[PDB]
Structure formats: C-alpha cells, structure tokens
C-alpha cells in the first residue's frame, strides 16, 4: 500500500509541460500554459490554451484539475504572470520558475524543478 498522492503532484506537472511543448511545435505558433482558473493561484490545476489567431477566441486544448485539495501550488516564477508561453521550438522553451508544492496539514514541501534541459554542461578541468 503506497497511495502516495504526493508524487502524482509531481509527476503530472513534469508531464503538463511536456505534453504542451508538441501541442506549439504543431501548430508553429506558440500556446498559454494558464493555471486553472486565472485570478488566484495555480492551486487548482493546469489548463493548455491556444489562441486562434483566425477568431480572436482562447481555445482550451487540455485540462489538469487536482482532485486533492491538500497540495498548496506556489509558482516561484521570475514573471509576475501567470502564463507560461510555451514557444513553438525545442530550445526556446524554458520560463524560469519552479512549483513549490505545500501540505499545510502535514508539513511537506515539495519542490519542482522544471530542469528540462538534457545538455550537459561538458567544460572544465
């Protein structure tokens, strides 16, 4: 018995993100990564957006809603806006910031590092 929802606040946005960086690359335009529900905080889920630049209007493509309300979502971001432009190319695709999950019940803190880059920094002695 290992019902852990701790590691599925992880492991569904390290994998919000990389599901979103295919769905820029295959329009060649770039999408809004909003949080659910737009003037609070990211604390009750993800949602992909598109803007349909032939009908001005927001298309939602994807929808992540935590269904555990014991996870406080607190984006460290260094943007006071909540929108993570998702560009449609593999290396310009990167916003600076890092969800900080907290469990004011039972003081956890969980820190995802949106460290999506596979170059390794190969230099020195």
């Known amino acids: 018995i290992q019902n852990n929802e701790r590691e599925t606040l992880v492991n569904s946005i390290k994998t919000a ?6 769905q820029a690359i295959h329009l060649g ?3 809004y990564l909003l949080p659910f529900g737009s003037n ?15 009908t001005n209007k927001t298309e939602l493509i994807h929808q992540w809603q935590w269904s555990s309300n ?11 806006n909540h929108r993570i432009i998702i560009s449609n190319i ?3 695709a990167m916003s600076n910031g890092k969800f900080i999950l907290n469990n004011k019940r039972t003081n956890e803190k969980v820190v995802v590092t949106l460290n999506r880059l596979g170059r390794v920094r190969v230099g020195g002695n």
Do not use: C, F
Request: charged share 20%; proline share 5%; aromatic share 10%.
């Open 17 to 22: 993100i990389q599901y979103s960086k295919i």
């Open 29 to 31: 335009h770039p999408i």
């Open 40 to 54: 609070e905080n990211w604390s009750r889920g993800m949602v992909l957006a598109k803007l349909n630049q032939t």
């Open 70 to 80: 014991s996870w406080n979502i607190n984006w460290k971001g260094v943007d006071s």
């Open 90 to 92: 593999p290396n310009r």
